[PDB]
């Protein structure tokens, strides 16, 4: 009844998510869905304007479903011949929707992390704007003055600001945040923990950027005393700030059941390190929340796996991980039969979810789980199941269930 | 016969170092020691000036040993009433003598890391100058245009570059490096690499700042061809750039034995993690290297631990592990050693750093590492010996060696 927006994406994910659609999808669920294909290909040939018309498609119909896609890079441009070198398609569609990324793992009883303190998942919630991802930077090249100026808009003295007088060559970079994001962030984040029952940290270097990085620090505080405090008290929950140093010690000592508010380049890195530190990037979910809750872009937190894909491309087996793509279609499905009051299909979403969770528990996996299990020395072809293999013998387990 | 800089410091970190001086370095060696008393109350006193007297005096002697000091920030600044808010001395001395910073843990076959795939040490160098740690920022307060201008010091046309129109509030901020400054991070890692003839990985975000970023990748790749690729294949090694994102998701899955290279901010927040997954900040090294290796200053990889000396104040009984600080002392040493042709004091230092890992892996620890190997819930006072009862009874050992 509502509409389900599908970004089709790039190299292993790519063929991995049809398998995921024809097989546990579609012969079970009937929804409207508007598709758009991001491969790298589809997007140098409209010139990227398929990247922008599906995130205003995700705007307007209120959830999105995506596989991942190649960010073009200098190699990129020169394997499929680009006529730029584009923009990653998730910045696009990030900046176009706004909000905050919520990444957290998939944990199996019987699949052990890397980090031996690690009992409970840990969501980093990353602030998908501003900073490195929208700055300006440059090589120098000759002799000269670095400054930056601000420009009242209503006249009156412009600030300036000396930065470095270059002499041998060097870099220079310009960035910016804003307080109507940092809010919507905040927002986002304090929301987030206190449905979940689960105490909020937010990680800031504010110790050496006392005014930028400050600016965080004061509009979370705010936030919680004005808006949540109360509320997080009675509920047996928290909000902190902590130095990004201490906070990543945190981590690798804490058991985890909290909420991790990072800027966007701290959400970008530490994302990855938490996922591998959980066993597998295969089993780690991604969803973009906007602020308010009514819109939602769903994903694999990881990649296109391109070393796989390589192997795929010349006939070898591959067991890469479909589990965190396939959770990117019950939780889009999931918010698609909440907001459309279609219990069957949100029921669905669960059921296939513990399937999934049920068919690892008993021994059915792809390597990468074995290998965690196991050790990579010690593994052979008979413990896992390829990626077709993994996703058939769910669709069986689903069926009866 | 040739001098050694020492620079005291604060709380916890210097009640133990007033421990390890008198009992385990004066009864056993006789070395010249210039003297510079870093407390907090005495840069307050001195207005810093200690700090920039210390520092010109390890470039000028070529090596010194320092205790972790606080960084004011604004709660400091009530506690002591300081006059202002001042540097970071480990900025300032990193600053004067340049170089990069070369952290490692302290492993003992008895003491588990939190991370179970880590099998050998991992060295992270830390390029100590430049990018948030020199940045200009500011508090965006009304509507106004945050721009960048680059200005030849040969007259011509200034590059201005439009950043952001601020309407609602928000942050800025402008960060440079130097070429001079990268080349010299690049080489220190390059000779630290080939050295102990393990591969070296720079990481990098360059996928995202091409031109501040790709700096880094295009030096370290042009110093690798001209230089170090010959010497690197013949010894079995290789260097490599890797993304930020996939090098901390290697981190974790690696069993260890590289040398990463690390831009300033990475460097400070993965070395943190990294101690920590080896187990406890207080055996985790830290070495400033200049570029050339002819002046080195030596520390602790973790600050005053403020969180102990509270309890200390209080006369409880603190189990905090010295031997980071004592390994600055003993690596300190054995670099005026090596200069002064002193083989005895040579193998003092080394023999000192043998019966600490001797007395550990029989079972004679700090709290820090009993936790490590029993878990919190499971450790009880007689499972370790408070900090004086530990260098007590390295020091018995010390005296039979
Ligand atoms: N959201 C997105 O659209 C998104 C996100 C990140 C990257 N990318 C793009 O994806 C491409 C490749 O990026 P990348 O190699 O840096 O990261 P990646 O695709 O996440 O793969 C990195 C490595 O992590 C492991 N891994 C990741 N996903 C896995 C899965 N489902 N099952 C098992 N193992 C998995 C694999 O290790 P082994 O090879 O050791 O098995 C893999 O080679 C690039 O073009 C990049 O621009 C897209
Ligand atoms: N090089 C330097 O001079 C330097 C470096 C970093 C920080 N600092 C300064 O040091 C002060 C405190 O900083 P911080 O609390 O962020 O970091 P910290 O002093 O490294 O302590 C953080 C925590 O790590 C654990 N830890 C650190 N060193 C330890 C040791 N030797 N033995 C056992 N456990 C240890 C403790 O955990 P538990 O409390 O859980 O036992 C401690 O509270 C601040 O004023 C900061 O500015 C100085
Ligand atoms: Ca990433
Ligand atoms: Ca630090």
Chains 1, 2 share one sequence.
């Not at 990247?51 to 999105?64: Q, W």
């Not at 300036?160 to 007088?165: C, G, L, M, P, R």
């Not at 005014?211 to 909000?239: N, P, Q, S, V």
């Not at 508010?261 to 295969?282: P, T």
């Amino acid at each position: 009844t509502g509409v389900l927006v599908e970004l089709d994406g790039d190299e292993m994910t790519r063929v991995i998510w049809k398998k995921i659609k024809e097989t546990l999808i579609f012969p079970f669920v009937n929804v409207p869905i508007e598709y758009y294909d991001l491969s790298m290909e589809n997007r140098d040939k409209t010139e990227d304007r398929v990247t922008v018309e599906a995130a205003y498609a995700i705007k307007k119909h209120g959830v999105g479903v995506k596989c991942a896609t190649i960010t073009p890079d200098e190699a990129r441009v020169k394997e499929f011949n680009l006529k730029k070198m584009w923009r990653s398609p998730n910045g696009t569609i990030r900046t176009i929707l706004g909000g905050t990324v919520f990444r957290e793992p998939i944990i199996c009883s019987n699949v052990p992390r890397l980090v031996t303190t690690w009992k409970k998942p840990v969501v980093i919630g990353r602030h998908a704007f501003g900073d490195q991802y929208s700055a300006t930077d440059a090589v120098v090249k000759e002799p000269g003055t670095f400054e930056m100026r601000f420009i009242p808009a209503n006249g009156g003295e412009p600030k300036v600001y000396k930065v470095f007088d270059y002499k041998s060559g060097g870099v220079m970079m310009g960035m910016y945040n804003t307080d109507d994001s940092i809010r919507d962030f905040a927002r986002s984040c304090f929301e987030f923990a206190l449905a979940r029952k689960w105490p909020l940290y937010l990680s800031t270097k504010n110790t050496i950027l006392k005014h930028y990085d400050g600016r965080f620090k004061d509009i979370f505080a705010e936030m919680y005393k004005a808006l949540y405090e109360t509320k997080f008290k009675t509920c047996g929950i928290f909000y902190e700030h902590r130095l990004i140093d201490n906070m990543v010690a945190h981590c690798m000592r804490s058991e985890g059941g909290y909420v991790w508010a990072c800027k966007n380049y701290d959400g970008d890195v530490q994302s990855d390190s938490l996922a591998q530190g959980f066993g597998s990037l295969g089993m780690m979910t991604s969803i973009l929340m906007t602020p308010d809750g009514k819109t939602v872009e769903v994903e694999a937190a990881h990649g296109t796996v391109t070393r796989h894909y390589r192997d795929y491309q010349k006939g070898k087996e591959t067991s890469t991980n479909p589990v965190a793509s396939i959770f990117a279609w019950t939780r889009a499905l999931a918010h698609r039969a909440r907001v459309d009051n279609n219990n069957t299909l949100l029921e669905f979403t669960q059921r296939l979810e513990d399937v999934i969770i049920a068919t690892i528990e008993a021994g059915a996996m792809t390597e990468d789980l074995a290998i965690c299990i196991k050790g990579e020395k010690n593994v052979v072809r008979a413990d896992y199941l390829n990626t077709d293999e993994f996703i058939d013998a769910v669709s069986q387990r689903l069926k009866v269930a």
